[PDB]
């Protein structure tokens, strides 16, 4: 198969509304936020940030034979199912700055990493030596752990964050929180992104 | 063939999702930024207007030029376009002009939109003699050098602008990481500018 054949198959058998749950087991979604810039800080207790959201999951229905065929293809996300990930403490609609394309591997693995400009409710502190800490809670908006399982490193600054920014990253720590309520048998997962930063 | 016949063929055989890699060699994309205006500089984001001259070949669009037009204007929605993005961009690129590309009978596509975009560039020392150099990193968002190969004063810049262009340099950077066999390319556009006095 050539790239055109692979892309036609994906487009024609496109079920973006259908979650790729392979026999009851949840879709393993891996999320990692890489901060590029901290633009505005207002005191309202708001923070305007630009970050790369590395999202990976498997969709076995997209898989193809890699023998004498490309190993990977670039597919627009409109032709693919995407997890309903949302920041619970978000005050702004997430603005996608980059081409809305995902990288699909022959094994069915989907790698989507858009650059997002978003405002968050955080305790801004910012001018202090200790620096203000900004807590972001990312999770599925409508699915529980048995449908979508979310997973996150706990360090790195790194090469991502702009040297020309007015702010400075102190530490970024991404942790998985799994809470099972008394009401309900299914667990509820989220990825808590802690961004502590200060003004230069 | 007339213009209507050429445009119908392009529309009907339209594969904008398909990269026109001919004989497994990468798509030679040529990018050149021509700065028109520098609007706002705030204390550290810069708001600029620039023409992005993008050229590449798509052999599937080719037609016989004998007793037929040499070139046609095609809307980019009917064509494949490279997934070029500025890595240091803070705002979504705003296309100001009609989203039309010029397609030649040999399959060459020439798209040049006027883009208004904000960038992360240090605003300290814009009033000084040397000014402040603004670095812009353009590259493919999802493709490597084996799929999309990127290649790089002004006589375009507005006389009515509050700022003045000192030098514009566009260089190709090809980096091959230890992990991975394929090379990774980008075009680094360095805009040196200062405030008028």
């Amino acid at each position: 198969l050539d790239r055109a054949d692979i892309l036609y198959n994906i487009r024609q058998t496109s079920r973006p509304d259908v979650i790729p749950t392979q026999r009851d087991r949840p879709v393993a979604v891996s999320v990692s936020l890489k901060f590029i810039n901290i633009l505005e800080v207002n005191e309202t207790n708001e923070v305007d940030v630009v970050f790369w959201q590395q999202t990976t999951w498997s969709d076995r229905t997209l898989a193809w034979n890699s023998s004498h065929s490309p190993d990977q293809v670039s597919v627009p996300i409109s032709s693919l199912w995407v997890p309903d990930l949302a920041a619970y403490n978000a005050i702004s609609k997430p603005e996608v700055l980059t081409p809305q394309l995902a990288r699909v591997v022959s094994d069915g693995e989907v790698l989507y990493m858009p650059s997002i400009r978003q405002r968050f409710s955080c305790d801004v502190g910012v001018d202090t030596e200790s620096g203000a800490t900004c807590r972001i809670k990312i999770g599925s908006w409508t699915h529980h752990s048995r449908e979508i399982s979310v997973d996150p490193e706990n360090s790195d600054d790194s090469e991502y964050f702009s040297q020309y920014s007015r702010f400075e990253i102190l530490d970024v720590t991404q942790k998985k929180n799994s809470v099972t309520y008394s009401c309900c048998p299914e667990a509820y997962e989220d990825v808590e992104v802690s961004l502590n930063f200060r003004k230069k | 063939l007339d213009r209507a016949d050429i445009l119908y063929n392009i529309r009907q055989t339209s594969r904008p999702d398909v990269i026109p890699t001919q004989r497994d060699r990468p798509v030679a994309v040529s990018v050149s930024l021509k700065f028109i205006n520098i609007l706002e500089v705030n204390e550290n984001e810069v708001d600029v207007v620039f023409w992005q001259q993008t050229t590449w070949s798509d052999r599937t669009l080719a037609w016989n030029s004998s007793h037929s037009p040499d070139q046609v204007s095609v809307p980019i929605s009917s064509l494949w376009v490279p997934d070029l993005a500025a890595y240091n961009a803070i705002s979504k690129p705003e296309v100001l002009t009609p989203q039309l590309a010029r397609v030649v009978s040999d399959g060459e596509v020439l798209y040049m939109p006027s883009i208004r975009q904000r960038f992360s560039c240090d605003v300290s020392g814009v009033d000084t003699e040397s000014g402040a150099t603004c670095r812009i990193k353009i590259g493919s968002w999802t493709h490597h050098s084996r799929e999309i190969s990127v290649d790089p004063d002004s006589e375009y810049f507005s006389q009515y602008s509050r700022f003045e262009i000192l030098d514009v340099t566009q260089k190709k950077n090809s980096v091959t990481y230890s992990c991975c066999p394929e090379a990774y390319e980008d075009v680094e556009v360095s805009l040196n500018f200062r405030k008028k006095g």
Partner: peptide, 15 residues
Amino acid sequence: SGCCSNPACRVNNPC
């Protein structure tokens, strides 16, 4: 890895 700092590299090499 320097690859992780690149967008095209991160998605093409499943860091």
